[PDB]
Design a protein around this ligand. Sequence first.
Ligand SMILES: *CCC(=O)Nc1cc(-c2c[nH]c3ncnc(Nc4ccc(OCc5ccccn5)c(Cl)c4)c23)ccc1OCCO
Length: 269
Amino acid sequence: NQALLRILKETEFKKIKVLGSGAFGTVYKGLWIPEGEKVKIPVAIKELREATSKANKEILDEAYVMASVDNPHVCRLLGICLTSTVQLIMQLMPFGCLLDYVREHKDNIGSQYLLNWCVQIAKGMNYLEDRRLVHRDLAARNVLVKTPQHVKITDFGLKVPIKWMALESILHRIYTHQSDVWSYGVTVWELMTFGSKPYDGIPASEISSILEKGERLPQPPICTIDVYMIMRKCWMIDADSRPKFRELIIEFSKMARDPQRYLVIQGDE
Ligand SMILES: *CCC(=O)Nc1cc(-c2c[nH]c3ncnc(Nc4ccc(OCc5ccccn5)c(Cl)c4)c23)ccc1OCCO
């Protein structure tokens, strides 16, 4: 369904400010100004670093998939511009990434917000699973905040993220929906610690020995045992014993209906 992806001319979008950068390239805030319309749409523009050598046709095939996602908790690719570089255009998410949001707001985040984010992320991942798409890089840095209670997963379809990876991904490069569930458990841990770094100060090459010994990320103080047990189930060595995203939607939706029962936040009780 080609109509879902706009092939953008260079005149149709303008990079105005920098949103962030790294080894991957640079993201800009700017405007999409479609020719023959009368509107200026706020967008993010991710310009990937120029590659020395896939051909346009293969890139467009993947971009068509990214433009085909239709779920309120998964970012959709709106347009692409292929030149010497690949530029990806999508709606601007004004509050930025969820990791930095929770760090910035760590004294002002309630239990219902936290649990709602867990529901929304599980819904987006369950959608990707229904589409037979494996994310491979779920993390709080790859959830974007459209408004404080509407978040969306980004950076699927595109430094190995060892500290978010299932053991079978580290050891055998196996990536499945169930290794995404492992990353989901780490992502929830990031939210419940208000953005702490997992395994802080531990070299990436030491993580597999931690997991092999049965050690895991610690129980966040605000988490009751019921919430931590979900997170621990996501880190089982047996991938098929981990929760499914459809079960995680159900369990976190139940907790979000009684948030004070399940998280004990600063000032509660
Ligand atoms: C947690 C740190 C961080 O990520 N900081 C950055 C935030 C943003 C950013 C801020 N507002 C945004 N709105 C919209 N998009 C982005 N970023 C963004 C991420 C991915 C992609 O393309 C990939 C993709 C598109 C569609 C579907 C699936 N994948 C785009 Cl186009 C835009 C926003 C930007 C950069 C940040 O820093 C990066 C380095 O830390």
